[PDB]
Design a protein around this ligand. Sequence first.
Ligand SMILES: Nc1ncnc2c1ncn2[C@@H]1O[C@H](COP(=O)(O)OP(=O)(O)O)[C@@H](O)[C@H]1O
Ligand SMILES: [Mg+2]
Lengths: 754, 788
Amino acid sequence: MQQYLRLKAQHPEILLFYRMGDFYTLFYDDAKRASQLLDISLTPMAGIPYHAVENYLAKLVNQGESVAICERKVVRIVTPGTISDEALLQERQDNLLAAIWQDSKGFGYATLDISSGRFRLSEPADRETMAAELQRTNPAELLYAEDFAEMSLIEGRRGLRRRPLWEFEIDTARQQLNLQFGTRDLVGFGVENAPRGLCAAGCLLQYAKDTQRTTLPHIRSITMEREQDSIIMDAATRRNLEITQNLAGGAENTLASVLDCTVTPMGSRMLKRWLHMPVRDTRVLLERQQTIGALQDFTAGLQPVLRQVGDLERILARLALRTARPRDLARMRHAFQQLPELRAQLETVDSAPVQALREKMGEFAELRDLLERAIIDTPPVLVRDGGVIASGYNEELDEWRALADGATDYLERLEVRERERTGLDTLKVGFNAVHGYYIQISRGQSHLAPINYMRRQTLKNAERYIIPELKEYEDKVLTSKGKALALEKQLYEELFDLLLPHLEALQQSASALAELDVLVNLAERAYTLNYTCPTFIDKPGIRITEGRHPVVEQVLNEPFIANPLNLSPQRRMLIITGPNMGGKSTYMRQTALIALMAYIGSYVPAQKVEIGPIDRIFTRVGTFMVEMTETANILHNATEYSLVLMDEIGRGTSTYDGLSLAWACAENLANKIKALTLFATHYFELTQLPEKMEGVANVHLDALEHGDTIAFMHSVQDGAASKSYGLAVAALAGVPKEVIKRARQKLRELESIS
Amino acid sequence: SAIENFDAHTPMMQQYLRLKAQHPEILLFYRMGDFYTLFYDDAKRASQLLDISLTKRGASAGEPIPMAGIPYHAVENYLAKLVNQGESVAICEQIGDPATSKGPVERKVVRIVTPGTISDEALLQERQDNLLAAIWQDSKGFGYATLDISSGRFRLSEPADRETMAAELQRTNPAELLYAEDFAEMSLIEGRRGLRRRPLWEFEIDTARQQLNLQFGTRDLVGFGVENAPRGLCAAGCLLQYAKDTQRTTLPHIRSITMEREQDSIIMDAATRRNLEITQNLAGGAENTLASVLDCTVTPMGSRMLKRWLHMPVRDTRVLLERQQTIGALQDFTAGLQPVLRQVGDLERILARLALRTARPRDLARMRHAFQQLPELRAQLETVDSAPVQALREKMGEFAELRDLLERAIIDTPPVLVRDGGVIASGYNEELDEWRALADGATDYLERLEVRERERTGLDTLKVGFNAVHGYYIQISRGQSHLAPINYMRRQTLKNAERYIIPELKEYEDKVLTSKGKALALEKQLYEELFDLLLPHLEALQQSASALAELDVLVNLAERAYTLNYTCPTFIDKPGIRITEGRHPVVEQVLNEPFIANPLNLSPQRRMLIITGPNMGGKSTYMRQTALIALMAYIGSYVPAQKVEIGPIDRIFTRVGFMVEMTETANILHNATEYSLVLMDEIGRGTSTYDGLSLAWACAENLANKIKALTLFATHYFELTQLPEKMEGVANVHLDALEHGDTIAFMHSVQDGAASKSYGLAVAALAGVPKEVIKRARQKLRELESIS
DNA sequence: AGCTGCCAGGCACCAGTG
DNA sequence: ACTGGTGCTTGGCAGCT
Ligand SMILES: Nc1ncnc2c1ncn2[C@@H]1O[C@H](COP(=O)(O)OP(=O)(O)O)[C@@H](O)[C@H]1O
Ligand SMILES: [Mg+2]
């Protein structure tokens, strides 16, 4: 099997599916890797069925493997960041290609969603911001330079792709980006003086073109993401807030599972992008807010219609790549048919941004009509076999179809004519590839076959014959069908030619429809869930009246206790004592989630929120080394515009070391950084802090003991906690009474010295 | 909805719905000709699970019947997909002859494939046990029983409380768990796989006694040491009924049951098992476990046995001494024995298939190959001076007579299945040879008929062939076919060839097919007859496999003790553990750097150590290695140390630092005795500065002064280093660290006394906390330190 | 060597002949 | 009530290329 070997050497770094009957086949180290990635057997040999190939390609590319398909020669390759087939993608998750590299000056980073054409670059200023961007964008495939120094950033990632340095050269990158966009320079995209970033974008674009071997006319723009434009969140914070993924790895019990009731897959993906990148420009935020208020009375009417638009964005990528299949055009048509209704419903909405979305959404009446006429109501999945183009669209096609129908009409009549003549009630006409059309008589009747019948195939219980009249009309059927099939294919290709000149407008429409989806959904969410519009103030501050945690209030069936928060430059830090038991943690996270939601333009779970500018959110909530590392990161990077949530640091080391660290951290956050800080602690000794320094106050959670249990209440109250509950929980858990009694004595002994 | 009374159904569906009612909650494969077939919701589910088409079966009454199916010869692959997903499937076969049946042929469910009752090699993992279990809860405690259907190993026990019952589920990890409908403590059992809610009657004591005595051929169960154990018997009765119902044959490999008493083994709680990473690491994999290091057995049955031992340390001094002795005596013999032992294979599971009468031709061939190793193993073991080894050598037997039978009965490399024949060797049965020689002159006769008919007709395209649908034929090309003899009777027409039959060839067809069917049926009869001749010897065969498996474990443990530099431990009268130069057996193999060996001295006078030292200093590892050395000593293995003396250990408890921690601490305080080894790892959590520590202090006191267990108490609370002065039986040790200015170095060496200091600030600095913050923390620390 | 379609063997269904 | 045709799952392989 030397034929496999020399073909494997052609792409030695990619799994090679090698076709062999009804299977694709892998050998040597490819078999091993594949066996462990897919739950299939070894023999070294693995095999995957042919009819399920797209399924196994979906799994492999979701796990970061490129795959070459060999049918010999390599005739198809799929890579994880460059797929655009519906079978290979998850409907409600973005799938990005990215490239990274590094200067002595700093980093360059670029991402592309090959379906939507959304192309971004950035130049992260340091290791931490780069790590945060990688986690946020979570690229399915990641191109990096050979000489990349900071390998620890990307080492554990799926879909890594080591690239030569010359692919990151600035002059090549500019020339190529300018060619792609039809520009002389990149000034119009605001990236002309971002060379670190452009280098990454150029390597990425070169790779994307190499995987497709096709123009990418849907990639018409690039945008730079600046640090000051967004609320920075590091990976640990992103994880701890459970924005789109929970701490266990799933999608339930997240902020998105409550807020994302979008109706299109493109709307879902956009909302999730917004949730992970809160914007600091209140001008954008005020517009989003005003749109959410103005769409309130319209969501019931809009959503059912919007649902029918579908994933127009991903459908348009396939038009751009000329891979769109008959049902993609039928879905595009169906979306066009929703537009007059959406336009009519949106006409009376009092909002400049809704009216702007309405314009941008378009109408495309002439494309609607084209597809109504050109394609049948519910076409087949593939165009390969025809039955796609509607009658009345092309006179030549209708004619070939008529001649085919008349020849098949004739043969059906021949069947009845031959049965009648022969008196043979089993006689029939059929068709297959080997014999073309044939007359079949059963075994028991077949000795009465007329003598002109020419025997051609004996079956266990039948005989098949031809006569010249059968072959005559066979040829009428096959040549007519063949002509019609080839004509359907040419008419279908011509639909691409008529649609593609409108691609830029179509992309704008789908982007508008996706944004409408998001904003109509946030509007329904706000109204349904009793949210309020936050206001922005000039200086750091968070003033919340009856705030709630937006996830916990919908998932638990116990009543949610709403709470106030008052943070300002004069009251910058709260020391939170009392039992934790989830209540402290929830009160802290709900603070971050309210800040996050305000800063995506959403209403918030509260009676009232006023909020100042926030640059970064740190959430050290949820080994001692890992707590101290995360604490270090907060102290090194927080500013007076930062929101810091800290959860009982000092646990995991000695009493006096932990108290000493917690006290130092608190002072540094209060007096040097001046962040707005919620500082949950178990140390009663830390409640003396308000007496020793300005801007610091005590609050606490308490418990109610009753019957034979304890109710940990979630009401945040002024002042220090005056009780501990560890021994009460120990008694309820069955620790022997004599042990509890001795612990109570040691406890008073220990506490009475302070 | 159609009213589907009995009379509204066709004869086929009446039969089918009756068999389905026997198995209402599980998939039913209903044999219809070449297809196992499913209907209604079974079809829809099978379609989704097995990725086969959902179709339908027409009805004259009106509602179409959802249908799906698979050809009978592909059943095994589909059974694998189902059982891997925890699904049971009832297999219904055709019993009757359709030619002599008016209506539908007689159909029976002949077996039910379930996750814990599989015995087929393709459905099992080689190196892992696959148990069925049954569990029952009383007002006072639990009954539990386990069966390994592929070996016949049958056990009962009566775990006294919830924590011990949890430990037993973790240890035995049943693939299928039968539980009584009135089970209260559902937290132990829900979200386990293979869960099977059973009616209470299946746990009735008198029925259990009746069925067990019937299975064993006994009047009572006194001789098995379980007559006394009704709680356990109720679970074992449920289990045995399930085993019988699933297999629907006799089960002669299940010849005994044994009670697992608390006193016979070291009971490790759930946390201990998980924290010592015996067979599973903390993140769920098989890597970097104790087994990954100690398991270099060469047979699957040895690999499974060793893992059972690691999980169940034995308290019987004599057994331990015998195992130790065996390991010492076998050390220079491991290289010779291991290649030969490897050739024995998984005789254990082959013998189960023999007992169930499902053993395939390559099972019997591997059985033969195993018998052929026994004389060599006997010769190698004769010279080993050790009574326990000679007792194993004896128990492994020889079976010369059965070896000879398989050598004569079966060919060198038989096919996978017996259904197509070609298994029984020539010379074994003269009638078979006769029938075969008929389908043998065959090949030659057809070539001669061909050349003769070709030369005689003068038609150079003439060929003789066979088709399964149409039979033997003489073929002539279409262009030459008009020239065929008028005598040639047309059989099958093709596009470009005509095929004919003549009386001579038809006669030859009838005798070759008659004789092929005869030879096949005779083969199947003789193959079944091999079972009849093997099975009388099953008891000695099973004891042989068990001896072969134990030899493999012990020979392995000898090789490990040599290669990893282990030593033989000794046992003392009273609780205590004296280790010189002890190591963590796993950590020393994965670390890419020297393991720092450490002492330990526990005795009734020095029974609790408060262990301090910096985070990352080696506190947890030091505790774990103590328990691992104990565990290894108590399976009969040599241990990672220069010297070990160890007293009796009844139990090992572990708590690695809300309601759960507290509850687990109380169970330890309620259940440890003076013979317990207790590992408390940074416990004591409260809501304020001192409540958690206060509790840890009081728990320590209770362990030291009332219970008197041997306790390793690792803590970050320096306040507890004051315990030794207050409390008899308690001492300080610590994990050494050095501070050379900027940084801290972890020496990993255990020293007597408390650390000079705690090192929280230094660990924080190491973690990256800004120097200016560490500076202020040190200032606050000096204030705090001036209090006393 | 690749692609199409008959067949395996049960049983009920269905339409023509009592 | 018979007689003789049809249908239905998936995997094997003859029968064509
Ligand atoms: N005796 C030893 N020799 C070498 N390395 C050790 C030794 N004991 C522990 N270590 C290493 O030190 C690390 C920390 O050990 P650990 O037992 O977790 O300390 P602690 O529980 O005090 O925080 C472990 O990963 C282990 O690899
Ligand atoms: Mg530890």
